[PDB]
Subunit: 118 residues, 2 copies
């Protein structure tokens, strides 16, 4: 439940976020996933808006990310972020805000521990 | 609002917390506030349950905390933690879970930033 509540704060911040700021998130999460897969050709999935951004700014993405090839995949219901997989679909990395918040849960718990026990 | 939602997680954890674990929180927050005030005689305020614990385990508190004198003050509506002030009331330190969560907000924001931008 704490994961859900923190994601509501994320969704509040996304409510006024400019496209340029959101794109910085897109590039960072894309790059991280692509580095991990260590492949030049990948398929990306996210919500409609995000895939539209990636398509619109592919030049900017290739400049900052190096020599990688991206193919849009199916749209998925997500608040943001990206799911990146090898072209053959064998390996998939989930970098959606929902999955990332779950993985960062430990950090929220460290904060709570500090509040309680210092 | 994010502060309120994280405090709901704190309140969930307090729902099953044993007296001994809660007392570790009490001692830690009391000690921190007393060190800051750097005074031997202080007055403490918290909810009824907490003041009752402090009263019941004053020996344990004095052993782990050194030579300090504590006087119970008025009960305040709080989830837990303590408010400690000099006997003359001139200086007061707010170490209630509510105040501490507010002060740790920045930590929750660092986590959110990581989720969004890595």
């Amino acid at each position: 439940e704490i994961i859900s509540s923190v994601l509501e704060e994320v969704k509040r911040r996304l409510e006024t976020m400019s496209e340029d700021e959101y794109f910085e998130s897109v590039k960072a999460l894309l790059k991280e996933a692509i580095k991990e897969l260590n492949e030049k050709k990948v398929r990306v999935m996210s919500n409609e808006k995000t895939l539209g951004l990636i398509a619109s700014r592919i030049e900017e993405i290739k400049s900052e990310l190096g020599d990688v090839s991206i193919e849009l995949g199916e749209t998925v219901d997500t608040m943001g972020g990206v799911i990146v997989e090898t072209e053959d679909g064998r390996i998939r990395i989930d970098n959606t805000f929902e999955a990332r918040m779950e993985r960062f849960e430990g950090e929220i718990r460290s904060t709570i521990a500090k509040v309680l026990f210092g």
